[PDB]
Design a protein around this ligand. Structure first.
Ligand code: QHH
Length: 289
């Protein structure tokens, strides 16, 4: 598309911001607020519609895990509730295959989900698919060659380097090569034939390391690290370059936005969000009106 949308997040409380960044002119642009604050959500795009999935409203007067699926139309600049998932999912992963949205893992209270469900925008309906072999909250999700990948996260006791892959036609999950670094709450995306895992939390500190999985070779290879350690960062791809947005570096909620150029293997600070925050949902689509 054209704009990088960031929705929700957390700073002192769950947030309702919807701001769009234009990598062509460096401009930010605040849009319609989310009807319900939510952190640990995920963002995705299907047929020009932006979707905010799961999360959790950490607020003074209470904390409520969200099973919501909200939908934003850039032409109207309006949100609209859509069908709700079977189960609340905080610290969630999502991935799009054949116009369908896969909601992966997440937490509801202290229940850590292995379950997975798929949303069909044409029927406004969810349906549960096969669960993951492992419970994963704060899981990174990526789609490559119509295959879904769940990478890292937290399973209730330990934080994981493990990763697994879902083959839709079989409705089946299988382990793939684990990462070289334990990552939970990382930024996972796809670029070319590789699945990048950036930052996260490894049980002790926030990570700035970045590695990528080559499906052909089935191996993880480290790559130039980010300039800031990050956890609960937003991540997306725009014109063959990765953008990581915000996160927590261990002491401050970052407004830093970094951009990875895979041809030069370098990271550079593109801009800075209008305020520091972690746990945002990110996606990319057309400009609004
Ligand atoms: C609710 C307020 C208190 C938490 C604040 C202060 C300390 C820091 N932090 C935040 O940045 C919060 C903000 C809300 C969203 C939070 C979030 C989003 C996505 C994934 C995860 N996630 N999933 C698994 C694990 C794990 O550790 O294994 C994690 C943690 C990031 C490592 C957490 C981050």
């Amino acid at each position: 598309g054209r704009l990088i949308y960031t929705a929700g997040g957390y700073f002192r409380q769950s947030l309702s911001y919807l701001e769009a960044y234009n990598p062509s002119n460096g401009s930010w642009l605040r849009l319609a607020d989310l009807q319900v604050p939510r952190s640990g959500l995920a963002g995705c795009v299907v047929g020009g519609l932006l979707y905010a999935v799961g999360g959790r409203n950490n607020s003074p007067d209470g904390n409520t895990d969200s099973s919501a699926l909200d939908c934003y139309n850039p032409m109207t600049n309006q949100w609209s509730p859509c069908a709700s998932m079977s189960v609340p999912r905080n610290r969630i992963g999502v991935g799009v295959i054949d116009g369908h949205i896969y909601a992966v893992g997440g937490s509801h209270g202290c229940i850590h989900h292995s379950s997975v469900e798929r949303y069909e925008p044409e029927r406004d309906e969810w349906h549960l698919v096969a669960p993951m072999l492992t419970r994963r909250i704060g899981v990174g999700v990526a789609v490559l060659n119509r295959l879904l990948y769940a990478v890292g996260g937290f399973d209730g006791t330990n934080r994981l380097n493990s990763a697994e892959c879902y083959y839709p036609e079989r409705n089946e999950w299988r382990m793939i090569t684990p990462m070289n670094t334990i990552r939970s709450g990382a930024g996972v995306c796809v670029l070319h034939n590789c699945i990048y895992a950036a930052g996260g939390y490894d049980g002790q500190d926030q990570l700035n390391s970045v590695e990528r999985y080559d499906v052909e070779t089935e191996t993880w290879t480290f790559v130039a690290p980010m300039r800031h350690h990050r956890s609960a960062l937003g991540i997306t791809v725009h014109q063959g370059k990765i953008y990581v947005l915000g996160g927590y570096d261990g002491h401050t909620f970052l407004d830093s936005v970094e951009c990875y150029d895979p041809d030069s293997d370098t990271w550079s600070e593109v801009t800075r969000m209008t305020s520091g925050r972690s746990g945002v949902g990110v996606a990319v689509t057309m400009e609004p009106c």
